[PDB]
């Protein structure tokens, strides 16, 4: 038979890859970092509280100027906040109220959203009239849209529940590239700082690294036991972190091609909803189902602090580009800005 | 008192936005939201047509006796249900459609599991969900006329080995309804409203209206502490 031959060849290739990875694992990161001082105890306080949403908040995203942000709720509203003064700049009503993601253009001129309607809608913020209007509606996915990120004013990459990712052209509305290879729903994606590669995580408990220009998969990372809900990229672009339903976070290195550290505790038995890094990459922030956020020493895998103050799930969090504040959204319909105290 | 003129103008704009948001929320809070479910083809489109008279999620709006309904149909979502069912946590009620003529048909996948036993599994999964612990279910049992004819040709013992055996519509309908209503475990905080669907298009919206009115009244009594 030929099916058995191909299955055996695939198994042999998997064994060869496992042996090649095991060859280069000489010492663990804990042993290497057992000679650096602990970060200490991290304490943060709530500076602002943004109210005005009437239902669960599902996503948020910072602007590149570290002052404006956009948030999406299932009451059918996108809201743009000025965080310094708490003022609302724009409120945008959506045609479909089942939104699950939102994005902010790095130029500051456009916003994007999508959800259970399988469509990514683009909104223009700078018009001769005083209103915000829809610019384009990208359609072509056969499952719910779970994430979207801008590359420039004319390019955007999305992940769908039909086990696929896509790179679009906003001016024409056509899919420029398609990324297939996952066997489960793709739940998140993250762009590298140079925007030449991106990493995705799916419900088959695996993550993948994709080349944007050539449109193929270079590397596949496994090790989790359940679905991966969140993914983030290390500041220097050579590592990334994943959060999953098995109540652990994990760190992967691109050049070593394997997992470096696991962040878990015996008192945590809930899934991770969101994950992010600090400006230097020393701290890792993760949001959980048990209503609070945990701060981890990335290099030593120790707990360092807790952000508490929400009455329901922490569904989204983000860190500014200058690293001055954190933002957390929640199912209790509030957003909070957090800062450290000298 | 330390705000420049443009700062005050921006604050005024923000206040106007707040007012509009509050008005929109007040308008939207006075509507009934229903989630429509069923296993495969079970007359669900027929029910949609009865109440009324690719895109992911389908919404139908209608009015009956000065009350506004919003019915959500999610049959086009072929992805994992576990990842988006919690979006419907706060609906008023779930309308579950079941075809009575499927008691002897077999799904053409394994040729071993008949369609009715798949509908029972779906109903068990939805009724005992953790997101729907206090949500009422309106159960529609469709195709009674076809069931009446099919009773004679095929006995109900094909689907239920433990049936006592009457081989009549009156007893078979009661047996099937009892089998479906027996799957509700926490039968103290949840109710089931059962209806045998008729051809006429006016006796179904009335039943939905009555059930929704009962649900709203009980919610208000529970809120006031009287229930």
């Amino acid at each position, epitope marked *: 038979s030929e099916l058995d031959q191909l299955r055996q060849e695939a198994e042999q290739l998997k064994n060869q890859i496992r042996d090649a990875r095991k060859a280069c694992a000489d010492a663990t990161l804990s042993q290497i970092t057992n000679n650096i001082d602990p970060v200490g105890r991290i304490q943060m306080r709530t500076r602002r509280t943004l109210r005005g949403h009437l239902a669960k908040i599902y996503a948020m995203h910072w602007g590149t100027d570290s002052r*404006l942000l956009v948030s999406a709720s299932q009451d059918g509203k996108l809201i743009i906040w000025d965080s310094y003064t708490t003022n609302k*700049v724009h409120a945008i009503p959506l045609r479909s109220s089942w939104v699950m993601t939102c994005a902010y253009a790095p130029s500051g001129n456009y916003v994007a959203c999508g959800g259970l309607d399988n469509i990514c809608s683009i909104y223009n913020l700078k018009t001769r009239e*005083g*209103n915000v209007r829809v610019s384009r509606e990208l359609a072509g996915h056969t499952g719910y849209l779970s994430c979207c990120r801008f590359l420039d004013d004319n390019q955007i990459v999305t992940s769908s529940g039909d086990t696929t990712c896509a790179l679009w052209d906003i001016e024409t509305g056509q899919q420029t590239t398609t990324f297939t290879g996952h066997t489960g729903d793709v739940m998140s994606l993250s762009l590298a700082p140079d925007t030449r590669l991106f990493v995705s995580g799916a419900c088959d408990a695996s993550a993948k690294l994709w080349d944007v220009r050539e449109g193929m998969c270079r590397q596949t990372f496994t090790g989790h036991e359940s679905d991966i809900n969140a993914i983030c990229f290390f500041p220097n672009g050579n590592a990334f972190a994943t959060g999953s339903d098995d109540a652990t976070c994990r760190l992967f290195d691109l050049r070593a091609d394997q997992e470096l550290m696991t962040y878990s505790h015996d008192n945590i038995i809930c899934g991770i909803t969101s994950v992010s890094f600090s400006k230097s990459g020393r701290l890792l922030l993760a949001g959980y189902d048990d209503f609070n956020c945990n701060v981890w020493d990335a290099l030593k895998a120790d707990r360092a602090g807790v952000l508490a103050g929400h009455d329901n799930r922490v569904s989204c969090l983000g860190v500014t580009d200058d690293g001055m504040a954190v933002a957390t959204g929640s199912w209790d319909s509030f957003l909070k800005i957090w800062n450290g105290s000298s | 008192c330390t705000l*420049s*003129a443009e700062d005050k*103008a921006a604050v*005024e*704009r923000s206040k106007m936005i707040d007012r509009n948001l509050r008005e929109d929320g007040e308008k939207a809070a006075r509507e009934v939201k229903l989630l429509l479910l069923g296993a495969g083809e079970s007359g669900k489109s027929t029910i949609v047509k009865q109440m009324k008279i690719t895109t992911g999620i389908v919404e139908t709006h209608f009015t009956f006796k000065d009350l506004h309904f919003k019915m959500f149909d999610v049959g086009g979502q072929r992805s994992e249900r576990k990842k988006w069912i919690h979006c419907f946590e706060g609906v008023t009620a779930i309308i579950f459609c079941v075809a009575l003529s499927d008691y002897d048909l077999v799904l053409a996948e394994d040729e071993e599991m008949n369609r009715m036993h798949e509908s029972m599994k779906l109903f068990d999964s939805i009724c005992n969900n953790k997101w729907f612990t206090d949500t009422s279910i309106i159960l529609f049992l469709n195709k009674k006329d076809l069931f009446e004819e099919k009773i004679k040709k095929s006995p109900l013992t094909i689907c239920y080995p433990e049936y006592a055996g009457s081989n009549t519509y009156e007893e078979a309908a009661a047996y099937i309804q009892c089998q479906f209503e027996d799957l509700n475990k926490r039968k103290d905080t949840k109710e089931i409203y059962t209806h045998f669907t008729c051809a006429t298009d006016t006796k179904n919206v009335q039943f939905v209206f009555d059930a929704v009115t009962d649900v709203i009244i009980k919610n208000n009594l529970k809120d006031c502490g009287l229930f």
Partner: single-chain antibody, 234 residues
Framework: DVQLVESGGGLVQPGGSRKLSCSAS????????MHWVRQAPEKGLEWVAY????????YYADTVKGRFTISRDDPKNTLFLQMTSLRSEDTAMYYC??????????????WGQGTTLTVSSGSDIVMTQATSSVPVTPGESVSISCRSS???????????LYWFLQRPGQSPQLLIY???NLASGVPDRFSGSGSGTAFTLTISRLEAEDVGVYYC?????????FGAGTKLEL
């Protein structure tokens, strides 16, 4: 396109009354605050009145308080100025101006065409433009200076100075808002800088359409004073 059209001018005997109308088209009228500004014959600009978005705030100049009333009608997209007991110093051309206020916006960015009105026979910030006329030739570079009596720099990083240019036989046009930013549709040759009280506007090159009068305005506090502009000659 954005349009503001004015009506209601003409000849009026002293002590009479008149109503001026301003009809808007092509933009979301209800979300903009609106201003009435006027220009006396062979003189400079002078702010008159302001009505906010939603008509929750109203401001008048001290020289017209008690005789002028500003109002808006949003369903029909109209702005009205009703004026009574008209003295001989009210003969002028009137302009309808739109402005919107949020973080990052550009107020005063569109002006109407104006209508003419002929009448028969205290702690305000002073804005000073020393030079009143300049001859110049194409291809060169020009600097225009403006000075203030108060520091326009607020304690939030913003300096509230605006630049306008009026070509002969035309309405004024915005060039620079908040002392550094460039308006939409304006060439990149123009630039602005300053400090506290002294401000400058520089034209890196020069063309044949830059002739006209240049005005500096302050928006730190009402009554929103102007300064007598500088005329550029060929």
């Amino acid at each position: 396109d954005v349009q503001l059209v004015e009506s209601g001018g003409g000849l009026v005997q002293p002590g009479g009354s008149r109503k001026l109308s301003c009809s808007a088209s092509g933009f979301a009228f209800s979300s903009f605050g609106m201003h009435w500004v006027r220009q006396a014959p062979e003189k400079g600009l002078e702010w008159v009145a302001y009505i906010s978005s939603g008509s929750g705030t109203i401001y008048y100049a001290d020289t017209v308080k008690g005789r002028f009333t500003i109002s808006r009608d949003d369903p029909k997209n109209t702005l009205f100025l009703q004026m009574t007991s008209l003295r001989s110093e009210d003969t002028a051309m009137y302009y309808c101006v739109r402005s919107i206020y949020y973080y990052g916006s550009s107020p005063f960015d569109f002006w109407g065409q104006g209508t003419t009105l002929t009448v028969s026979s205290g702690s305000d910030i002073v804005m000073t433009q020393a030079t009143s006329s300049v001859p110049v030739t194409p291809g060169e570079s020009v600097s225009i200076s403006c000075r203030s009596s108060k520091s326009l720099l607020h304690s939030n990083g913003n300096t509230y100075l605006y630049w306008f240019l009026q070509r002969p036989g035309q309405s004024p046009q915005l060039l620079i808002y908040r002392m550094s930013n460039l308006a939409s549709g304006v060439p990149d040759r123009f630039s602005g800088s300053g400090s506290g009280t002294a401000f400058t506007l520089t034209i890196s090159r020069l063309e044949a359409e830059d002739v006209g009068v240049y005005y500096c305005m302050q928006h730190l506090e009402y009554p929103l004073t102007f300064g007598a502009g500088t005329k550029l000659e060929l």
